[PDB]
Design a protein around this ligand. Structure first.
Ligand SMILES: CC(=O)c1csc(NC(=O)[C@H]2CNCCN2CCC2CCC(F)(F)CC2)n1
Length: 130
């Protein structure tokens, strides 16, 4: 309905705002764009399902997220991909893992602080009725 398309538009506006706040944070620059095979050859062969914040923004604009949980699944994938690709004790690996955990925790804390829980439930219920 018109009331339902209004709800999904508000969700997209909200998810764009959260994603932008993540993307301008200097800690998360490694997560803002896809990994260049020129510069990281092993990546596209260790990580079967790439994800980054530019790809999240494109999915929002393609109406691919109908619930906050669907969005957080791709945030969780950015983080779990980073932990999986950087398992070593090397300080470079520990640094990326630290930032990956901070990206995940920051997204969750923004949602917990600023999203109404009745709003997420409305999104769920509209979606389960389709
Ligand atoms: C998207 C993703 O998960 C990803 C992309 S490259 C990668 N990690 C690396 O290539 C690790 C591998 N082991 C050796 C050290 N490397 C670089 C660490 C160094 C940390 C600071 C920095 F600013 F990030 C530059 C990179 N991970």
């Amino acid at each position: 309905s018109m009331q339902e398309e209004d709800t999904f538009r508000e969700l997209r506006i909200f998810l764009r705002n959260v994603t932008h706040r993540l993307a301008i944070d200097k800690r998360f620059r490694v997560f803002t764009k896809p990994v260049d095979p020129d510069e990281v050859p092993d990546y596209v062969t260790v990580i079967k399902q790439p994800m980054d914040l530019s790809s999240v923004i494109s999915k929002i604009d393609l109406h691919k997220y109908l619930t906050v949980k669907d969005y957080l699944r791709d945030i969780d994938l950015i983080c779990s991909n980073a932990l999986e690709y950087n398992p070593d004790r090397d300080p470079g690996d520990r640094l990326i893992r630290h930032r990956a955990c901070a990206l995940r925790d920051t997204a969750y804390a923004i949602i917990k602080e600023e999203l109404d829980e009745d709003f997420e439930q409305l999104c769920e219920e509209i979606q389960e009725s389709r």
